[PDB]
Amino acid sequence: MTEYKLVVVGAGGVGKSALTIQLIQNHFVDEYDPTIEDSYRKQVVIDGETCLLDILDTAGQEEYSAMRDQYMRTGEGFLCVFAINNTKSFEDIHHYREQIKRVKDSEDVPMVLVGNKSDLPSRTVDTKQAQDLARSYGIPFIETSAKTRQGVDDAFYTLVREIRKH
């Protein structure tokens, strides 16, 4: 019955839709439509306290649109996703974290850094570099695989814990 507005951010192709779908529907969709943006609602129990999740899975190319800024205003927590095999996607995290801190006007915005596709063999972003970035932000870092399910509940639930702590 308390509702959390969550926003899933990160470059195209990192797995934002595969994570969100895995969480909601419990399976891995290979090659989900790259171009669709929507919210998904789910009722979950975390640490024994029921809540409603309202999760925006962002899509589209954007030089910073007004509609995106409106959704960032509404967001209560941000899941910032990169892919461990994609150096550019990791480089983009800086930029998301700047926008988030600007829109919310705050250094202390509930956020979790998510390194997705942890099942993949050719890792290009070092775990230690992500851990260090996360630690410098003071936010949790969780490696996930939307394909394996590894980490998926933990990423979203930890973001909820971050809202609740805050």
Ligand X SMILES: Nc1nc2c(ncn2[C@@H]2O[C@H](COP(=O)(O)OP(=O)(O)O)[C@@H](O)[C@H]2O)c(=O)[nH]1
Q: Which is nearer to ligand X, 10 or 140 (CB)?
A: 10
Tokens standing for 45? 């129990």
Q: Say if strands 38-46 and 49-57 run parallel, antiparallel, or are unpaired.
A: antiparallel
Please give the residues from 112 up to 151 whose contact with ligand X meets the rule CB under 6 A.
116-117, 119-120, 145-147
Q: Is 22 in the site for Mg ion (CB under 5 A)?
A: no
In this chain, which of 46, 54, 69, 161 binds ligand 0QW, going by CB under 6 A?
54
Give the whole-angstrom CA distance, residue 54 versus residue 40.
6
Torsion sign (Cα): 74, 154, 62, 95: positive
Q: Is 75 in the site for ligand 0QW (CB under 6 A)?
A: yes
Give the whole-angstrom CA distance, residue 44 versus residue 39.
16
CB of 2 to ligand X, least distance (A): 27
Q: Is 15 in the site for ligand X (CB under 6 A)?
A: yes
Q: Tell me, residue by residue from 28 to 67, as one string, x for binding to ligand X by CB under 6 A and - for no binding.
A: --xxx-x---------------------------------
